[PDB]
């Protein structure tokens, strides 16, 4: 079966694969079906945005992605508490709530609190009964300039701010970057073996 120089291949076709083969001949019709479903959903919630509630800014877990951010599931109960929003009233005005998410730092906590205070500034709350507004209801002059928002509410963008150019000091020139990394690995590797000698 083998021949002159080649690659040892691994064809995973030793089962009855032809019995289970999914073709994508309905992919164009699926694109129209989802597009049509979004148009029907938009008419259902006519003033409300078609995307849905507001998603918070979250930091991706792993080292491969902990530099960028994305849209999470919902705002933490601590962020709702800091922004002065009740956990149950938030879902009525289109705010996603995630009772599971934690806040280990104040950088991510204040990131969404600002995002959550900014969304409530753009809210146009219609009255429960149009013939009698209430305290939380917006004024009739503001209800006229109320259109359905298309796309995600407050798209999460990460605009990179430039580090200001500065004259290099002698302390930065004398800093040994390679020596500080090799010694950091040794001090973190020999930390336990030195802690026993101290006893």
């Amino acid at each position: 079966a083998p021949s002159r120089n080649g690659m040892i291949l691994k064809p995973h076709f030793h089962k009855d694969w032809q019995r289970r083969v999914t073709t994508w001949f309905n992919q164009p019709a699926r694109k129209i079906r989802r597009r049509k479903a979004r148009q029907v959903k938009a008419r259902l919630v006519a003033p409300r945005p078609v995307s849905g509630p507001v998603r918070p800014v979250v930091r991706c877990p792993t080292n491969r992605y902990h530099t960028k951010v994305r849209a999470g599931r919902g705002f933490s109960l601590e962020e709702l508490k800091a922004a002065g929003i009740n956990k149950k009233v938030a879902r009525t005005i289109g705010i996603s709530v995630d009772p599971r998410r934690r806040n280990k730092s104040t950088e991510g906590l204040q990131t969404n609190v600002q995002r959550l205070k900014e969304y409530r500034s753009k809210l146009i709350v219609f009255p429960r009964k149009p013939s009698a507004p209430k305290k939380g209801d917006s004024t009739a002059e503001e209800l006229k300039l109320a259109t359905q928002l298309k796309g995600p509410i407050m798209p999460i963008r990460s605009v990179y701010k430039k580090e200001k150019a500065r004259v290099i000091t002698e302390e930065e020139k004398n800093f040994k970057a390679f020596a500080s990394l090799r010694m950091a690995r040794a001090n973190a590797r020999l930390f336990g073996i030195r802690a026993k000698k101290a006893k």
């Binding site: 083969v21 073709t23 001949f25």
Partner: protein
């Protein structure tokens, strides 16, 4: 833009035909089980047999669609547009432009608000492009082949 075509999976195989083996002066082909039917004793599976399975039945998962690079798809348009500006290539294509005002035939935007066919027909008569429409009428014929049944 073409639709997938394929032969049924059960074609030529929805029969319990067993080869008679050797020693019967037959051709060792799977033959239909006995009975009071003229089908009994006939080949049923091979591609050479009448009513059998075709060789390599066409599968629906054939790679019908080809993907082209966006840079090449735009390249071909820039070349087809550049070719629509030469009088030799338009005439060699067969269009009747021997009397049009200019080879790149740009008209005013007033023609984008037309709403009747007689307005469009009159525009083609003024631009001397109606001779190409009459050439389409002279080419209206019937296809040669099984396309007429499809």
């Amino acid at each position: 833009n073409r639709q997938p075509y394929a032969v049924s999976k059960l074609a030529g195989h929805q029969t319990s035909a067993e080869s008679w083996g050797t020693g019967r002066a037959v051709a060792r082909i799977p033959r239909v089980r006995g009975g009071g039917t003229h089908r009994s004793g006939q080949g049923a599976f091979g591609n050479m047999c009448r009513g059998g399975r075709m060789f390599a039945p066409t599968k629906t998962w054939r790679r019908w669609h080809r993907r082209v690079n966006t840079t090449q798809k735009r390249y071909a348009v820039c070349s087809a547009l550049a070719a629509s500006a030469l009088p030799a290539l338009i005439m060699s294509k067969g269009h009747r432009i021997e009397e049009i005002p200019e080879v790149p035939l740009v008209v005013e935007d007033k023609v984008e608000s037309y709403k009747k066919t007689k307005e469009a027909v009159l525009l083609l008569k003024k631009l001397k492009a109606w001779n190409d429409i009459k050439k389409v009428y002279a080419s209206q014929r019937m296809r040669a082949g099984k396309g007429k049944m499809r």
